[PDB]
Design a protein around this ligand. Structure first.
Ligand SMILES: O=C(O)[C@@H](COP(=O)(O)O)OP(=O)(O)O
Ligand SMILES: O=C(O)[C@@H](COP(=O)(O)O)OP(=O)(O)O
Lengths: 255, 254
C-alpha cells in the first residue's frame, strides 16, 4: 500500500522579518505567521483531511501553528505530541545574527554551507551568547529524553537527522504503517532532514532544497516507508517558488 | 499536602448570552470566555505552577481553555490528553433550552433540581432534537473507548461520575501519585462530579456546590488521593463568590 502524510513549516515570526536566525530561541508567531497557519488549515479543510495524530517540536511557534490548523478543521480533540527531536536545527553562535550580515562578513558561499550543507556544523553557542540562558534554563529541556547538559550547542543537518530519525522510526512511522492520517508541524531544517531521509536525497543534493514557510508539504510513502515520489507543495506554485527564492535570497548580498 | 492538582471549568461559551444549556454541543468560547482562560493562566503563573500534564474533555471550549492557559504559562509544550469522559454532563432533551425561560415556566426550584440534583436524570435527547445529529455524527465519538450507540443520551450527576471515575482511576490518578503536577480543564458538572469523589462529598451536600467559571480550583491530596481539606478557589473570594452567584442566577427569573 501507499501512505500520505502532511508536513509543514510554521509561518513568520518577528525575527525572520529582520532576517535573523531564530533556531532554538522560543519566539512566537507574529500576526502574519498566525494567518499563514490558518490558511494551511483552510486548505487542509478543503481537502477534507481528518487527522488522527499531530507531531510538533517543543518550540511554541510549532505548537501554535498546529493548534491554529486544528481549530480551522474543528479537530482540536486530535492527539498532539511535541518533542525536541523535531526542533529546528540548533544554529549555535549564529543564533540571533542577521543572515545578510553573515553573507557580508563571511561571504555567500560560507553562509550557504552553514544554512544548507549536510555536514558543516555551526560554531557552538557559548554561555556568553545573548540567548544562551533563555534556551538552556527552560524546563522543557530539563524533561526531554536526554540530559540538559547532553543537548546540542549547535548542529549540522546530519546532527539533526541523527536525533530526529529515531523519533520518526519509533513514534511516527508506526502510526503511518497503521494507516493513521498524520500532520507534522516542524521547522525549516528539521523538515529538510526528514525529507532527505524519506526521499533518499544525497548529501550533495540536499544543499539545494529550500522549504517555503506556511505551505503544506505533501509526501506519499510506500510499504517500506520510502517516498513514492518527490515531496510537493500545496498551493499557488508561482507564489511558492517565489517564497522559496526569498528564503534563498536572505543569505545573499544585495545586487 | 503530599499532592496538589488544579482543576477548573471554562468560561463563557457561544450560548452563554442566550443562557442555553450547551452540554455536549461543541460551541466555542466567546470573547469573555477566552479572557477568563487567560486570567486563569496569569493567576497560575503568579503562583509558579509548572504543569507536567493536562487533561481536557473532547469539547473544544475545554481544549482551547487549556491552550490559552498553557500560553500564558509559556508551557505550550506540556502534554495534553483529551477524553469524552471529562465532557460536561449530558443534558439530554434540555440541550439548547433557555434556563431562565424554563425557570419561568416550571419554577426556579424545578430548574435548580434539574441543574444540581445528584440522582435526577434529564430526559434523553432524541433523534428529533435539533442538536442530535450534530453530536452523534462527530468523528470524535467514533474513536471513543465506547461504541457510538453506547454513549449516553442524558446523564444525572451520578451518571457523570460513573463514566468519569474510570478515567480518573486509570489515567489521571496514577500520574498524580507519580508526583506530576496536573491541570484538569473540565466543565461545570464534570468538575462537580470529580470534587464529590475526591472530597467525599455526600449525595445531599453535592447539590449545594456550584462552581465559578475561569477560577483555578486547588485540591490538596494525601497518599490515598483523598482531599486533605476543602477545595480552594484561587483568587479574591469576594469576586469568586460573585462568579458563583452569576452561575446560580442563570436559573433565576429576571
Ligand atoms: O533557523 C531558523 O530560524 C529557520 C531556518 O533558517 P534558515 O536555515 O532557512 O536560514 O527555521 P524556522 O524557525 O523558520 O523553522
Ligand atoms: O453546558 C452546561 O450545561 C454547563 C453547566 O450548566 P448548569 O448545570 O450550570 O446549568 O456546563 P459548561 O458547558 O459551562 O462547562
Amino acid at each position: 500500500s501507499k501512505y500520505k502524510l502532511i508536513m509543514l513549516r510554521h509561518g513568520e515570526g518577528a525575527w525572520n522579518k529582520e532576517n535573523r536566525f531564530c533556531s532554538w530561541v522560543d519566539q512566537k508567531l507574529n500576526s502574519e505567521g498566525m494567518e499563514e497557519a490558518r490558511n494551511c488549515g483552510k486548505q487542509l479543510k478543503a481537502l477534507n483531511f481528518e487527522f488522527d495524530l499531530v507531531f510538533t517540536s517543543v518550540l511554541n511557534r510549532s505548537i501554535h501553528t498546529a493548534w491554529l490548523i486544528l481549530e480551522e478543521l474543528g479537530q482540536e480533540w486530535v492527539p498532539v505530541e511535541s518533542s525536541w527531536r523535531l526542533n529546528e536545527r540548533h544554529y549555535g553562535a549564529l543564533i540571533g545574527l542577521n543572515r545578510e550580515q553573515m553573507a557580508l562578513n563571511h561571504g555567500e558561499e560560507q553562509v550557504r554551507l552553514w544554512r544548507r550543507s549536510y555536514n558543516v556544523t555551526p560554531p557552538p553557542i557559548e554561555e556568553s551568547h545573548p540567548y544562551y540562558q533563555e534556551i538552556y534554563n527552560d524546563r522543557r529541556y530539563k524533561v526531554c529524553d536526554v540530559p540538559l547538559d547532553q543537548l546540542p550547542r549547535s548542529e549540522s543537518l546530519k546532527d539533526v537527522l541523527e536525533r530526529l530519525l529515531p523519533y520518526w522510526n519509533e513514534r511516527i512511522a508506526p502510526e503511518v504503517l497503521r494507516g493513521k492520517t498524520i500532520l507534522i508541524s516542524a521547522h525549516g531544517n528539521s523538515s529538510r532532514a526528514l525529507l532527505k531521509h524519506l526521499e533518499g536525497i544525497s548529501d550533495e543534493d540536499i544543499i539545494n532544497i529550500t522549504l517555503p514557510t506556511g505551505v503544506p508539504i505533501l509526501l506519499e510513502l510506500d510499504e517500506n516507508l520510502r517516498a513514492v515520489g518527490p515531496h510537493q507543495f500545496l498551493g499557488d506554485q508561482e507564489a511558492i517558488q517565489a517564497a522559496i527564492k526569498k528564503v534563498e535570497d536572505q543569505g545573499k548580498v544585495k545586487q
